[PDB]
Structure 1
């Protein structure tokens, strides 16, 4: 019939191809869809939902419910950090297993601003000011509030509103970052410090907890879908 020439790539199976195939059940009467609540079109919609960060991965806290709580107290003011995180949303252990991290571990490249939301879970009678800081990479990781205040930061006043959002802006040399611990595409450093201190009256718990959440911003995106390392099979 029609003269044809078989190019290279013939008879190959590429799992990413997009080709028409014969139907094995022709004329099947497909059940129509109903309007089910909660439809999702993009994985970034899930990445945009705040999920609690397992911040406290110490030996006795990891793999319990205590790994999500960070304990503050009413001690005297100090410049040492409350918590320190590395901005590796996919490879950092404290971030890898959040929903954002879980989605990023199916992709190779990511880019966009993040939001960290901290919720104060002390009593109504507790007051304080915290400093949540993001340092772009390149310099030494801030070991005191004096270093941390030189980077991006927010001073959080704990009052009638017990939650504060810090947006980590997209500050990268490359247009995309890798989802692995990588020096050339390192993200930066999140840290928390006491601004003044936590003050409580008498007959109040002197130790309280903060909970951490992370999510993506509307400018976030990923690409180069890959296989995750968070699931494996034996034999």
Structure 2
């Protein structure tokens, strides 16, 4: 026969290998495909879809629909945050279980910009301005609007547009961040504050809800496929 020399790796089974193998059903007349709607070519397509953030994971709200609603009211202006969460899309509990977080938890590395949309669900008669801020990491997380306004931010007029989108641009020392809580690849902070205040006339609800959505931008990518911690099997 042809002289051959078996190298290391011979006879192993690497689950990630890509080798040919014999067909157990030769000459099978495969049913041809049809043009089903909604074909998906890349998992990032799913990550680019806005999905609702469970922003309110309090004891009484977590694992209910209330966890998706953040309550604003028409009280007097303050500089204290409405909501706060870290830019760890795979490991921050508010973001981990979003579609983006679910996809990222199958990968070790992620990079790219993010889109955070906020939808105001108060009455048409309610007016107000909010400030939505991204602070890159390395400093104290914004405790008040005075600090938050120094970072990237957007002023949202709820009276004008019920929805506001803030793009958190990719800014990182590393070319990729890990999909775990990691100090070296920490992604920064996201906060919301009252810019002026929510104002309502009489005979109007004085408390309303906003909803948060997160998605990946077109520059987003992931690497190093891995098993997720979000599913387990017992026994």
Q: Normalization by structure 1: what TM-score?
A: 1.00
Using the alignment, how far apart are the partners of 1:160 and 1:170 within structure 2? 28
CA shift, 1:65, in A, is 0.2
How far, CA to CA, are the matches of 1:194 and 1:24 in structure 2? 65
Is the partner of 1:44 in helix, strand or coil?
helix
Following TM superposition, by how much is the alpha carbon of 1:67 offset from its aligned partner in structure 2, in angstroms?
A: 0.0
Secondary structure at the aligned position of 2:101 is classed as helix
Q: Secondary structure at the match of 1:66?
A: helix
Whole-angstrom distance in 2 between the partners of 1:6 and 1:211? 61
* Bigger shift: residues 157-166 or 83-92: 157-166
Equivalenced residues, count: 235
SS at match of 1:211: strand
Q: Give the secondary structure class of the aligned counterpart of 2:91.
A: coil
CA offsets 1:118-139 (integer angstroms, 9 cap, x no match) = 0000000000000000000000
Match of 2:102, SS?
helix
Unaligned segments of structure 1, at least 5 residues: none
| Aligned residue number for residue 113 of structure 1 | 113
Please report how far the alpha carbon of residue 159 of structure 1 lies from its aligned counterpart in structure 2 after TM superposition: 2.0
Segments of 4+ moved more than 2 angstroms = none
- Give the Cα separation in 1 of the matches to 2:103 and 2:139: 29
Counterpart in the other structure of 2:87: 87
Give how far 1:57 is off: 0.2
Q: State the shift of 1:197 in Å.
A: 0.2
TM (norm. structure 2) is: 1.00
CA positional deviation for 1:35: 0.3
Trace 1:220-235 onto structure 2 (pairs within 5 A): 220-235=220-235
Cα offset, 1:161, TM superposition? 1.9
TM-superposition CA deviations, 1:127-171 (whole Å, max 9, x none): 000000000000000000000000000000112420000000100
Determine the C-alpha separation between the residues in 2 that align with 1:21 and 1:161: 58
Question: Equivalences for 1:24-173 in 2 at 5 Å?
Answer: 24-173=24-173
Helix, strand or coil: the match of 2:128?
strand
Task: State the alpha-carbon separation in 1 of the partners of residues 21 and 210 from structure 2.
Answer: 54
CA deviations 1:171-215 (Å, max 9, x no partner) are 000000000000000000000000000000000000000000000
Q: Distance in 2 between matches of 1:48 and 1:159?
A: 27
Please name the residue that 1:182 is paired with: 182
Q: Helix, strand or coil for the counterpart of 1:46?
A: helix
Q: Match of 1:126, SS?
A: coil
- How far is 1:109 from its partner? 0.1
